[PDB]
Amino acid sequence: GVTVKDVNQQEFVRALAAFLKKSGKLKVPEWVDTVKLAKHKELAPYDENWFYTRAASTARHLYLRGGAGVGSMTKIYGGRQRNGVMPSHFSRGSKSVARRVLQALEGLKMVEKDQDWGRKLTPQGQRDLDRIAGQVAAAKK
Amino acid sequence: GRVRTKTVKKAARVIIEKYYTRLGNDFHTNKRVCEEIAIIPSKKLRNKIAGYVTHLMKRIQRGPVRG
Amino acid sequence: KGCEVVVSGKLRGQRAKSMKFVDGLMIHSGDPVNYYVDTAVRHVLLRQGVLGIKVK
Amino acid sequence: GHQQLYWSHPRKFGQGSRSCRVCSNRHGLIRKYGLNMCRQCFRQYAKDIGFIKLD
Amino acid sequence: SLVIPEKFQHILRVLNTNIDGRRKIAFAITAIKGVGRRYAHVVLRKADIDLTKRAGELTEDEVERVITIMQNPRQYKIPDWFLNRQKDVKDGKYSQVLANGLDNKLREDLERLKKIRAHRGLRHFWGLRVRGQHTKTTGRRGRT
Amino acid sequence: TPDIKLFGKWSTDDVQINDISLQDYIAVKEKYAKYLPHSAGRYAAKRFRKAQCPIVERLTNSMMMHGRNNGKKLMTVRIVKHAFEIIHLLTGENPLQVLVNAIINSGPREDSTRIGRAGTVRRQAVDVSPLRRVNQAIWLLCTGAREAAFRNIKTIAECLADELINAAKGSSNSYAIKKKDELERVAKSNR
Amino acid sequence: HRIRITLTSRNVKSLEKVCADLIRGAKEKNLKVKGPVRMPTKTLRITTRKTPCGEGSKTWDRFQMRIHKRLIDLHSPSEIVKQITSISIEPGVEVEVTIA
Amino acid sequence: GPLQSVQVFGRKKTATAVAHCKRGNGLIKVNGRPLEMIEPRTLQYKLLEPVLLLGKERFAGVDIRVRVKGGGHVAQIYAIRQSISKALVAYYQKYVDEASKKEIKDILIQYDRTLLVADPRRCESKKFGGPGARARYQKSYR
């Protein structure tokens, strides 16, 4: 038996993104093609279906730590904002992107609304993540 | 460097002049004697005094001291 | 063990001058200046100006 | 209307709504910890308050 | 694949301006005034053009389609805030403005400000910094 | 229980230094060999403690320069590892042997110091300390790689690699050997 | 009753003296008592200039005021707490009694 | 009934790393994940220094679970690589005849002294008049 902690996180996120792409029940919004992920970003993402990757990263972060809502989850996807001539500063990500990701994962049977302002994982989602981790570990071994 | 001042040398000279049968070559023993018999309001001064007493007795068991 | 009285201002003249009167022991540096000496700075309203007092 | 002409300007913020509680000056205030004093008067009265120089 | 295709366009004529086809398509059409790197990624996202192909080997049907999207994008689901010239001062219509049109619109805006005799138009007529900043120690290219 | 100890994948044994003046100043012989070129430090605290520092550590410390690269150590470590891959892959021998022989060839033997009053260009010919020779060779090789990999399509790890291979034989084409010969001739000029 | 006594002051030696007095009183009154909980110290710093005008080298002052806090737990009714806190209190030590 | 255990810490700048050694199968996992999957991947040899220097047979009958917090990245790596060796030394000292403790401690000292004793270095306090602890602002003449 292997959990996600004993397998590489990058390959886990990529395989989980492929799994949620193959499931086809995520309800991708219409403005995904023309949107900027944060106010410090400059261009659109080069990946065409990055919503599955963002959903996989959000699911992995919720498995690692619970009780994360929207503005808590926004702080994870932060970075420096190159202000041109002014010096850089740290800025948060977008709010509606995280809201749509957590709403899509609540619509799917993977995320349960944790009591007192949080979003935990459904035990079916935890089981699904353990299958993905075991498949990646078996493929690597 | 490490050069002692008037208070350390004078205090060491008077404690060897007033006491000899209790003080010795070991630094910790005469350090505790200087704790007991002398009023030292600090600890670095106490350690410097006890070190100079150790060096002075290392001089005295070899030869005479004119001070 | 000591005292120091200094009077500052104009004294029988247009140009100001300071007369310091000290005897005994007086320390200035370290922490033992804080809990030994007491220093008070007051003023005198003379007819030709203001006079300074610093005693310790 | 002199009485309501005297206060056509509401001073509820800015530098002119805050003054030192000793010398009535409006420059270099200390708003930290609810002091509301200028720097010179704070340095003058800092011994009796409790602020002492250690570091 | 890696070999050159037959009938390879070296210089492309788009809106009577020279565009090389040697660069990436998302960064070759940005030489048109009025379009940029963010807008080039959106005009190429609604119509089916892959972003990994160079601009010299694209086909004429794709070229005409991206011309149509870059002229009139409001009916192909492009948001109104994403456009540059929204709520126009004369007719009030949302339109992304191309190169010679951008120059003409800028000229009419400057001539309108000069005619109405505003502070910004007067500072444009003099040749000063119209946004408002300390030009005491900066901008030494104003005179010789 | 390792029989021998490998610097990542390179054997630290079967290497020698030809110049006997730098036996103790180049530390790659079974006492100072480690796995990675990133130690805990405390090598410049004393007056000759840096002589025990390994030459790979010295090159890794001296490579990061020019403002924008200060503090970036792990990047320099992976540059050094990719470089040593290129030296082993091109010449065929061990990268540590090429690195040690590059210090011998690119180190100056004698230098001219300033003498006289102020303003004069009067120089006196002296000879260099053996540790200063090592430092000068390390500095010259690193700045040669730096000026090679600037505004060029060649990468930094390849430019470091071609600088060490050229300096290992002295082909009068690397920048460090040219500067060393220029220093030798300008010090021999006013002797 | 789960009654709590909070002990705070500026100086540390008077606070330690009155705290040790309260602990030894609770020990001699034949009653269980928890130890003093040492709260982290709060440091109040204002860094201000030294010259009143704008002349001279830029020298700054570093004023500092540390505040200590202690927590004291008892298992007694209210009159025991009042009779143990109403005798021999330090002049520079501020005390607050809370009950639940 | 009786159980044997030891808790040994280690630090470099401000990152403490408390280890835990007791009886069990040989397994080393820090914060739940093993040593071979600790970022950064450049310093995997530096993390694996004590195990690969002492041998697998020394870690044959002990399990290790280390929690680490504070510091940056490299300070955390140095804290864990000090804490593993310190925990093994203390475990052999407490529950084994210490000839084994001597024969691991002599070669640990002979490799690097960092593996056992700490690094007594902290950051100096900034002073007014400059951007750092030692550097000063530029002084203009005329």
Next chain:
Amino acid sequence: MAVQISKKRKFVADGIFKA
């Protein structure tokens, strides 16, 4: 009370009252 200022503000106000 209904105000209950902080522990730092209480000591600051006490020092101001003393001054």
Next chain:
Amino acid sequence: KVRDKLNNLVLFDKATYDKLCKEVPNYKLITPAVVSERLKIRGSLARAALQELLSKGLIKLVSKHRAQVIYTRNTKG
């Protein structure tokens, strides 16, 4: 002392392609930088050419990194 403005090629020609597939797999060290030097090609083209040569199974890989790729020939022994 001539600048010689680099007109690197984005896509291949009929002589560049077969001179590369004749000569470049016989190099002792193959890097995108050095094949861009010796072939006067664009940098992304060199990455594509080494990727397709790796897919064809004619070029050995020794290390992979986001800023450094090194390619060799097969062992002649």
Next chain:
RNA sequence: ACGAGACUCUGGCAUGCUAACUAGUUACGCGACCCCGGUCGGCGUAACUUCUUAGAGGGACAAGUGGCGUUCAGCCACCCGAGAUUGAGCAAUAACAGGUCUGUGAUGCCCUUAGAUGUCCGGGGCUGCACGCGCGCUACACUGACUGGCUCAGCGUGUGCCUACCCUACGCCGGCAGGCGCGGGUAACCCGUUGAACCCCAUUCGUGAUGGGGAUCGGGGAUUGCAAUUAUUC
């Protein structure tokens, strides 16, 4: 006698002492999931200070060894050792036509005092540009720019007196800047296990004033305030 030293604060360490449901650890039980063990800052409870907090103590003195020295004051090197030069605070006689009358209900003289040089209200200016100088910020790139994923802190601040104006997790709406009902925190309790950046991994780019650099400039939308034009800020 003063100044230095001496003194105080802080950093570095003690598996020993005294204590912690406003800080935890280790065990046990109840849960979720994987293949009998592993993961969980999920829940609860019997010991303790290993982490944390802060009080009293201890340790380091040229103490030991080998040299140089009038064998005096001292210097060099080394072993054991967490340290064998951590940083700051305070700081003498004598003065300077040094700066401050625009910090002061500290102040002498002089001026003004109702057609005021006090006072209040409205508008403007302190930002105005052929130029010169100083402290600085951003870059001149491929040890790099962009796009995703991974992972790591410590000093601090916080609902106010005339004094309106605090820090914010959470659910909804919108690309984003932002918007109403919704809870906590007079604070090791809530923000907060302060998911900080630089760094690390993988694509895109390839010597081109280029996807470097973002000055100047046009159009639109929000928040603060009684009011933003000479763009407050985003």
